[model samples]
Target: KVIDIKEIKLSVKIAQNDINYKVKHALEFLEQGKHVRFRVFLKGREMATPEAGVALLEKIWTMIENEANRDKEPNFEGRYVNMLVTPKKAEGHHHHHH
Candidate 1:
């Protein structure tokens, strides 16, 4: 069975503590075998410098390193800096069922 990509949730964060909160929720989603999209929206002057947004996403990446694998590096979509991550599969022996 395949899960619809759209069924995954996107966690949006605008600042420091928000990143922590969203990262926590993201781990929960990953624990349940769901993908997560992390997004940082830049409003007004915040949009002037994309570096800040990129840095924020990088910080999130470090926090959730073991729980998830990034689908791709973070990039900008207009004023939104976003990254997609999926749950990391277990690394061990595999059991096949007929």
Candidate 2:
């Protein structure tokens, strides 16, 4: 389940539902003992304050942090802030089961 960086890039800028789809897909990849590269993109005016984008990314990261790590810290340039997340290998856990 090693996702190619290009695949995740292609999923960017899609609709919220689509983003969720990509997220679930990434989670599935992680469940399979695979490394998932999670990324968040900011565009145009939204990039003015990278903080907003970072905040959004942070929220997303929180959801998967137990399964991943901040491989690339968020940063801004031009009109966007970006970060990379990579999954860590470990026994999977489910909240309901725990």
Candidate 3:
């Protein structure tokens, strides 16, 4: 289940109407057994409130609920709070299966 992040296209901010498109791309990644990382970076005053960043991450996780898992809890590293999410593939599925 190796995913080439470079091969996967990603848009930091997309048009509201294209959200479904973005979600579909994410789902495709999940189906391929890839872990998705969503980082909400806060600057200046925004960093003062960690909860804001946490909430934003939570919302994104909620949106991709069925497809991902909060593998790593959010943590602060060099003034940025981030977390890692891995897709939940069907049980007993072999990554080497073609």
Candidate 4:
């Protein structure tokens, strides 16, 4: 009920090719004033590989650190890593779309 929330779910595998684009998108999302949550999913053979998740975390955070504030430490949600970020100023548009 404070500000609007949105999330971006990502995969760690193709991140070598994906790392650049997402940070830009995430910045745009926060710049638009919604709280944003990011998730890097690790699954299957990737389950044992949580280290890469941390690297990806640093990459995005370093890019978004100025545009947004960190709200949650990245979490290990079973097979994924999720982190939350907040806008400089709160803005919410309640959605009740039909």
Top lDDT hit: 4
lDDT of 1 by residue, 1-98 (tens): 45423232233335567667778888887776667777777766767777767777788889999898888988878678887887785342362223
By summed lDDT, the worst window of 10 consecutive residues in model 1 runs over: 4-13
Q: How would you encode candidate 3's per-residue C-alpha lDDT over 1-98 as one tens digit per residue?
A: 35643122222233444545555676678777776665555666766777766665565567777777767776556565666667777454565666
| TM-score, one value per model | 0.74, 0.59, 0.67, 0.74
The parts of candidate 3 lying over 4 Å away from their true place are 1-23, 90-93
lDDT score at residue 85, model 2, on the 0-100 scale: 67
Please give, for residues 1-98, the per-residue lDDT of candidate 2 as tens digits.
Answer: 43344235322244667656666777667665555544455655565566766665665577677766767766665445566666565444552232
Q: After superposition, how far is residue 52 of candidate 3 from its true place, in Å?
A: 1.1
Error of 3 at 21 (Å): 5.7
Candidate 2, position 77, lDDT: 52
Lowest summed-lDDT stretch of 10 residues in model 3?
A: 5-14
Tell how far residue 48 is off in model 3, in angstroms. 0.8
lDDT of 4 by residue, 37-73 (tens): 8888875686787876766776677877988888878
lDDT, residue 19, candidate 1: 66
Candidate 4 — worst ten consecutive residues by lDDT sum? 89-98
